Design a protein around this ligand. Structure first.
Ligand code: HEM
Ligand code: HEM
Ligand code: HEM
Ligand code: HEM
Lengths: 146, 141, 141, 146
């Protein structure tokens, strides 16, 4: 996108303190918990029947890293959000058929996770920033849809 | 919409919000205006600055209503009649702004109740606040 | 959600759909699969071709349920209990696909009932079908 | 966007038979009728209180032309959907502050109007086409949002 250049430094300096594996996993665990229709796309991970089963699940964690981890890149890459996801915007349209309103869904629960983990360091203003970022990404991920 | 573990879970969690609902409430307002400023459009008469005493004013109102609702889970259409009117009829609030309040409110909760904001509790609060919002735009539906 | 002129208006209009609901129903299915093919994902076992007798099969089912609902406007959560399960619980239908059925169904109606599809009637049918859909995903909410 | 090149000829040949003034007006009349929150943005048109008041209203008609009329261009212009609306994507973000989920809303009621007006000539396949087009446009109209 753009943001701003204080907006930029504060985002990065946070990301710095972000544990991709804890945070990716919990981001995804809630996604499927809170919007259970998402579970269609991850039936392969076997048992998701209750919240404990879900959070525990190890593939779930894995895969939440992966995603947190791509998100990661977009944070580092804000000039070239489309260029980055194009092969995955590709992924996600053709093969998986996921509605984009989901990537946005996810973008928010991510944020709410980051919130839970950073407490009062997560500011209003700093939230905003990420809401953009996450937005930014959720978007790049619907462009090379066609 | 609400299953009894939802009713249970909501009550329970709201019990932990305590008398912070006011402030959680006007903090969920701050975050929205910063991160979705499309929204300030609706509070032109308000001082939106960085601890406005109207916003204060306001979130106690909002934390108060929320708290009422918890009260009347079984009869929400009734409980929020007067207020379904105000947002639907008088103000004509684009409903999409409820979805963003909602979130800014889950987000506030997590900042402050991080232990408690379990996934379980996360998803109930989501239905709740989604049920709340439908009532608050049913006067369109 | 539904105001009594909505209940009135819905009943009235459904009266004009007549026994076409079946076909209006499997036509609203065709249009969706063509114009939103994300959706066929959910009917892998089906022949989706250009007058499939399953789709036939199906839209009579759907036109039938719709018709039932009209019946039970006052008690929809009850009427569609069994079927809130099927879409929410078993199939886990992304709700956004109800919004597209809905529309493909308003669209079918207008093609065929162009006189009758007044704005008034247009908006009720919208709430109706929106209320219907919430019930059909409340087993998530 | 793209579509396809039969998809393209059939779209155009329809548009040909489209009365921008009838159809623009009814498109907009329903928008405000069916999604009454939209009325915020058009309070200047005075009285919208019931459906008859609305459809009758003359500014409403006017303005529905205008929009139908821009839509018009995008149909004629499918290669360069962003390039076209940029000054209006501009309009619509900065000055008016309209959520994009509205432009999509509108795009659909348009379609439902076109449906009402063309009866069985409005095909399944032909619907699809327009769903793209309208999509296409609804999009170009959220890009130069920032
Ligand atoms: C913020 C939006 C999202 C982003 C940025 C994202 C990112 C990714 C990435 C980077 C990959 C690896 C692709 C590869 O290199 O093979 C992937 C694959 C995959 N994605 Fe997501 N994703 C998003 C949302 C979702 C959602 C909402 C679902 C379903 C509800 C989903 C389902 C899958 C699955 C199951 C895989 C494993 C596929 C494999 O092992 O080939 N994604 N995604
Ligand atoms: C989340 C659920 C919400 C609740 C419980 C809620 C509640 C309230 C309450 C309790 C009032 C009381 C006003 C008074 O008597 O002073 C009010 C007024 C108002 N609400 Fe909300 N509201 C909600 C969501 C929203 C949303 C989404 C918006 C717009 C984006 C909004 C905008 C307004 C406005 C503009 C007023 C007029 C207030 C004034 O001028 O003092 N509210 N609402
Ligand atoms: C518009 C409201 C809808 C109604 C009233 C409805 C109704 C039905 C009904 C009546 C059945 C009966 C199945 C039987 O016993 O054979 C059914 C099954 C099913 N529905 Fe829907 N449905 C609705 C929307 C949807 C949506 C939005 C989707 C997905 C996008 C969907 C996908 C399915 C699927 C995949 C089945 C399994 C059917 C089979 O294999 O025979 N339905 N639904
Ligand atoms: C499909 C999405 C839409 C498109 C393509 C569109 C198109 C347009 C165009 C081409 C103009 C003329 C701008 C100028 O040259 O000054 C305009 C202005 C304006 N638009 Fe829309 N519009 C859309 C949706 C909406 C919605 C949903 C609203 C509010 C609910 C709205 C509110 C206004 C108003 C009130 C004007 C009159 C402003 C003036 O006279 O300067 N538009 N729009």
């Amino acid at each position: 996108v753009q943001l701003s250049g204080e907006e930029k430094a504060a985002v990065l300096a946070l990301w710095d303190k972000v544990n991709e594996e804890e945070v990716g996993g919990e981001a995804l665990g809630r996604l499927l918990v809170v919007y259970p229709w998402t579970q269609r796309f991850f039936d392969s991970f076997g048992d998701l029947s209750n919240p404990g089963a879900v959070m525990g699940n190890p593939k779930v964690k894995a895969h939440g890293k992966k995603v947190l981890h791509s998100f990661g890149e977009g944070v580092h890459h804000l000039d070239n959000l489309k260029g980055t996801f194009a092969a995955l915007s590709e992924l996600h349209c053709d093969k998986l058929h996921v509605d984009p309103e989901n990537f946005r869904l996810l973008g928010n629960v991510l944020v709410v996770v980051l919130a839970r983990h950073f407490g009062k360091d997560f500011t209003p203003e700093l939230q905003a920033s990420y809401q953009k970022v996450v937005a930014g990404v959720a978007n790049a991920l619907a462009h090379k849809y066609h | 919409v609400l299953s009894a573990a939802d009713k249970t879970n909501v009550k329970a969690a709201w019990s932990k919000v305590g008398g912070n609902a006011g402030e959680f409430g006007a903090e969920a307002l701050e975050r929205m205006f910063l991160g979705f400023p499309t929204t300030k459009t609706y509070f032109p008469h308000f001082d939106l600055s960085h601890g406005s005493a109207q916003v204060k004013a306001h979130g106690k109102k909002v934390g108060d209503a929320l708290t009422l609702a918890v009260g009347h889970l079984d009869d929400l259409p009734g409980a929020l009649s007067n207020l379904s009117d105000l947002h639907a009829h008088k103000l004509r609030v684009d409903p999409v702004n409820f979805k963003l309040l909602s979130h800014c409110l889950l987000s506030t909760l997590a900042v402050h109740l991080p232990n408690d904001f379990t996934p379980a509790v996360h998803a109930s609060l989501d239905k709740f606040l989604s049920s709340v919002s439908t009532v608050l735009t049913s006067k369109y539906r």
